[model samples]
Target: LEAKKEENLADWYSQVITKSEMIEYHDISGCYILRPWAYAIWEAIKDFFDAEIKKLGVENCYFPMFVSQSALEKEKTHVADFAPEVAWVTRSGKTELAEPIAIRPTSETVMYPAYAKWVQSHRDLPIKLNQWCNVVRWEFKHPQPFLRTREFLWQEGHSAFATMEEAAEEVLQILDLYAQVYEELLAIPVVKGRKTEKEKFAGGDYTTTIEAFISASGRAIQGGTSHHLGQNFSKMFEIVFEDPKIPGEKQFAYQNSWGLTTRTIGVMTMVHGDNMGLVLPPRVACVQVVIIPCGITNALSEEDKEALIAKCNDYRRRLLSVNIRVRADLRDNYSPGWKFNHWELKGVPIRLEVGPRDMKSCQFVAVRRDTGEKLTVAENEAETKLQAILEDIQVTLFTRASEDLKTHMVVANTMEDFQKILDSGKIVQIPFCGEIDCEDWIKKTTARDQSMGAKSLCIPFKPLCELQPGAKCVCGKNPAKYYTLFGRSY
Candidate 1:
């Protein structure tokens, strides 16, 4: 089935994922099977991040997915918030277990106990462990593949440091890496900001996130989060260490936990995809280029067909030699038009079409997926020409999405303006009083139709400097303290 992405984005998203052969729905609701196409893209992201974190002295490890009832309840403040969503395994076959085990909604409760056991002295003060695993949240709301699946894959980084300075610095450093994942690899722009107290991760001292805008639905997606847990989890889990400088002193280690999930792929698809199909960024596309043998007809002799196949294979080898992910479509039964559409629907960043006429001219046609721009490149220059085109497509997608973000960011000084901008389907930025009560009031007052009312997306690191020091809050109660982005979210 073909998708008209612009007309019905939700339907189009579902169709493109299946038609492109990225994922298949599972028998259980909110579960999906990632096909090779989707898994390869995830591997690309994993390889990039796995290597990057190693540079920071982070070691990879695995923790059990199951947390005991007592362990989960040990951190009441954090566990209480996730209680409703946690999935429990109370029975094994026909026998009932003495105590129910909860599937980890997150690894905090499961990993922290180990941290408490592993840390003892000043030398072991800084502990950095990262796990690549799947988490089950058992969400009851609508579940979209990659976006909101109950069981999804992700890498969670949990780190502990002796000093608060180091913990805080690492939080932002990791957050910047997440921003790179979106802009550098996914070809989508995002805003780096700190979550407000009300919206911050439960039991975290503060949370920071990279937020991306989805123009199709006019909603913001929290692309990824790096949270500074401070001493909350450490204290709860008894992760204590001896101070080296001061004798006979015990201190709770400051900690940070951050995660970037499969939801990233969903955000990229939403941001860069078009009416044609998925427009993958070259950096993350499993097949960056697909080579097609064109203009073959029934009139062509067997010798001519063999020659065309050889030419396409030669080009594919040349592209591969440069470390490009390349594929050549050589199915004998399909027409050139069919092959072209197939590659386009799969979102291959570039397509090299070789026809008999062009073969004789020592040239091939190059089509860019992002813009559908076509150009002719000499056979000898195909390698460099195609590489340049792929790079161009990456920059073009990022630029377009960046412009969309800038355009949708509206500044509001009054409640009316806030409601008006939100009704028009834009992310409204306003100076906030930094009070939960005012935030609650704004959400209740401005909600329209089916929207759950706009919530605080984040208190951006950089606030508008033009506003007067004592500018009144958008709620008009107290002086504004920080600039917050407010919008409906997925």
Candidate 2:
């Protein structure tokens, strides 16, 4: 596995994606059309998050993909962060428009203006809405498939609150959802925290992120983010709500915006994938179990073929009865090995092979993706045994990822040690002085040549998980204010 990963990750990744038939490159640069297999995984993720948030009373809505230039200019910071990458629809069929429209890189500018008009009083406060759509952000730099595509699908959540506490609560709630997506669905562990001032999302007061290290390659990826707008959007768009307590008293609404995207697919692949191909948790695998008929040649007795077909159908129905996503590989043209490799590359979590020999023994074979362990179960108990094994694989994958994170996380107390660990390209949790200059210096010394190289990730210190006080920030001024995570990011 190590040798395969070291061979050439780019080639390996491309092969897996194409061979699995998950996506195909489009004529346009940095764009891909997701095949059904890949999109099915996305649908599962979408369903989970949608149901989870709806349970919290957040309503889903639709938003436009085009925002006028003037509307996008509402928040200066948002404009600054997105202006360079904005794809303008300057002309329609060779006719130059007086005002060019910007493709919605994000819906903040477009949604906030409408939100300002819709929200009038405290009675209308706490507007929680989400939209599932595609956003485009043009890029001239290196573009990876799902990770850095010019256009991608995502769910953007926006909420308005009457008080800071309410807005802040929403931010944390969204962050928890993102963490669940990584921890439960992807079986990946993450460090959740607030980004420093320098790293906060554009047009937002603060941003919370779930950052995880891609175990297979040891690179950090920002899994998801929830930003606290903190009246930034409301104030800019003049969204004033009258307070019920003070009759005519008015104030800008506190707000939050959060999102998760298809980029997560890439992160999951990077973290758990091996030489064989993508490794997806059972919860998100489109085809959880693939049953193949083995030992049957092109020429078979009528009784033999009938029995084989019956067994295959029985297995499929048994799995389906237990709500497992199962499919039978019955194509006579392909060998069982061909089907096994195909399913492995596509990341089906389990595989079951049954043949005349196994049938005579009254048993079936089950193969687990994570451990490569095989188990034989009585034919009558195949469904029950497979369900138990799937649950085990899910728990074991998460435990494995958590252990990997624990092993890679380094503690740095001194400038020398901090620099050394940073040089080694590991995610180091340190006591930061909270000074912009100190962070800048550390980044400069450890960063690779390009801007895409190693940079710092600021994970907030959870009170429950606080470490013993470290030396004064290595700047010799004061005790560290927070436990921050820093690493080379992709």
lDDT of each: 0.88, 0.82
Every model's TM-score:
0.97, 0.95
Model 1 scores worst on lDDT over the 10 consecutive residues at 74-83
Error of 2 at 228 (Å): 1.3
Tens digits of lDDT, candidate 2, 1-490: 2236556776777667777788899899899989998898799999999999998889999988999877767456464745789888888899889899999888878888888888976788789999999999998777788888899999999999889999988888889999999899988888888897767786788999989887555568888899998988788888888876777787889998999999888887777777877788999988899999887876768798879878988999988988999999889788888888888888888999888889888778999988788888899898788999889988998898889888877777776776677656567777776777767766776654424344567665462246564557765676777777888787
Can you tell me which runs of candidate 1 are displaced by over 4 Å? 1-3, 77-79, 448-450
| Candidate 2 Cα errors over 4 Å, as ranges | 1-3, 74-79, 448-453, 463-470, 476-479
Compute the lDDT of residue 263 as modeled in candidate 1.
91
